[PDB]
Ligand binder design. Structure first.
Ligand SMILES: CN1CC[C@H](N(Cc2ccccc2C(F)(F)F)c2ccc(C#N)c(Cl)c2)C1
Ligand SMILES: CN1CC[C@H](N(Cc2ccccc2C(F)(F)F)c2ccc(C#N)c(Cl)c2)C1
Lengths: 246, 251
């Protein structure tokens, strides 16, 4: 085998296809369908984390916290991948039954789609491999901690270092001390920049949630709890984002 | 007499007494306390709208700017006013929310939000310490209304800038009424404008609690009245996310 066993393991634990449940055209039905997709994505991330090496060994509260912190980040990062893989970055591939092209219009909603659109464009530009993406995804899950830190801070630190090492192996699959180091800068800078992007997504999400009755948008129960319980404190800056570059 | 005209005007358009409509004859619960506070908050908001219509300069900003400045400043103005009534009526040593909702420290302790009461209680203790005059308070309260703008600015940005600058000059005059000499009066300016800068930090804690309470309103049996609900829904997450521009007097 020439692909490292951890990257191989990560490949094997990747989620199956997730459908939004959409009727194959208003922003209420769209948001409702995006919310259903959100619920299914959250369930998928939680199940995925049960098989992710190192993660089940963290304190249970740390696990829950890290999944809640990174819910939106992992969704948008997965959106970037699918859009890149299936439509060359030129549509937003939320799910096989929810693909948004030459916009499906004019509002705040479609402005946030253009912000989300930056990530697929960046995957196309950088030509991210699946091996790189899988290691970057675990680092995204581990990319923010509480201000007081985690209960299992030592285990968390070791797990982060292991996957940073695995991203470097991932980068090594394709040559040269200066080019592989430049590419590490570029890939870890993309992760840094996601904090600023995801902040815009969290804000719109929480606003939309608190006026959901007025907008006629149904918010499923599991994702409502992450939104209700975490997004206010996150938006307020009551968490510590982790950066690779000062 | 000695009092400048605009300060006399500010005193004249100050609100009437406002009651929370709280039933003090039965024991505090967290839902009855927060529900009475929301009822008080609604009534204060209405009075801030009425007061703003009489505030020289304010009516001549774009209707959007006026709404936005009220929606940005409502919590700041409430706790500033709470601090002033507490200072004036009970020597700063109880929280005087309204004539029918007064919390001494034991009643604060027995509430579910003791830490938040102690955060609010800091303001009156500062008023006591500095011996803040009514003339300074009245100018400082207008500066709070005008103390955060959108990141992209206001529609009437020039007229806002000019309105704010006039009340800063008026605060400088209110200071001169008592503080004589360049040394004392400019230090006093530093102290009072530093107090207003610090409120940005204090209010950030109140906003987070307020927004959490709002989201959890049904589970907590805490009713949020109409106008208070729209100001929270309109701006509070944006404000908390730092997607507005707080104005500072000091770097
Ligand atoms: C209200 N929210 C909650 C979740 C849902 N959204 C987020 C979203 C979508 C479009 C535009 C704007 C946003 C914003 F709220 F985040 F800003 C969502 C759902 C599923 C996926 C996937 N896969 C993604 Cl990448 C997003 C809408
Ligand atoms: C949920 N909020 C919204 C409005 C009301 N609050 C704020 C409050 C009260 C107690 C403890 C904590 C807070 C906090 F939300 F700010 F934190 C309120 C209402 C009326 C007055 C007056 N006068 C005041 Cl000073 C506060 C309760």
């Amino acid at each position: 085998q020439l692909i490292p066993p951890l990257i191989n393991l990560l490949m094997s634990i990747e989620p199956d296809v997730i459908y939004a449940g959409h009727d194959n055209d208003t922003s209420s039905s769209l948001l409702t369908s995006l919310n259903q997709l959100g619920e299914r994505q959250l369930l998928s991330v939680v199940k995925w984390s049960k098989s992710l090496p190192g993660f089940r060994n963290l304190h249970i509260d740390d696990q829950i916290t890290l999944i809640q912190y990174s819910w939106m980040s992992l969704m948008v990062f997965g959106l970037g991948w699918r859009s890149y893989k299936h439509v060359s970055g030129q549509m937003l591939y939320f799910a096989p039954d929810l693909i948004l092209n030459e916009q499906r219009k004019e509002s705040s909603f479609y402005s946030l789609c253009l912000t989300m659109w930056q990530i697929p464009q960046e995957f196309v530009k950088l030509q991210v491999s699946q091996e790189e993406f899988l290691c970057m995804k675990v680092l995204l899950l581990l990319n923010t901690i509480p201000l007081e830190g985690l209960r299992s801070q030592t285990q968390f630190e070791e797990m982060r270092s292991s996957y940073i090492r695995e991203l470097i192996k991932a980068i090594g699959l394709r040559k040269g001390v200066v080019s592989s180091s430049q590419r590490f800068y570029q890939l870890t800078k993309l992760l840094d920049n996601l904090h600023d992007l995801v902040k815009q997504l969290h804000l719109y999400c929480l606003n939309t949630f608190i006026q959901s009755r007025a907008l006629s948008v149904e918010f499923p129960e599991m994702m409502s709890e992450v939104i209700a319980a975490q997004l206010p404190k996150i938006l307020a800056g009551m968490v510590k984002p982790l950066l690779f570059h000062k």
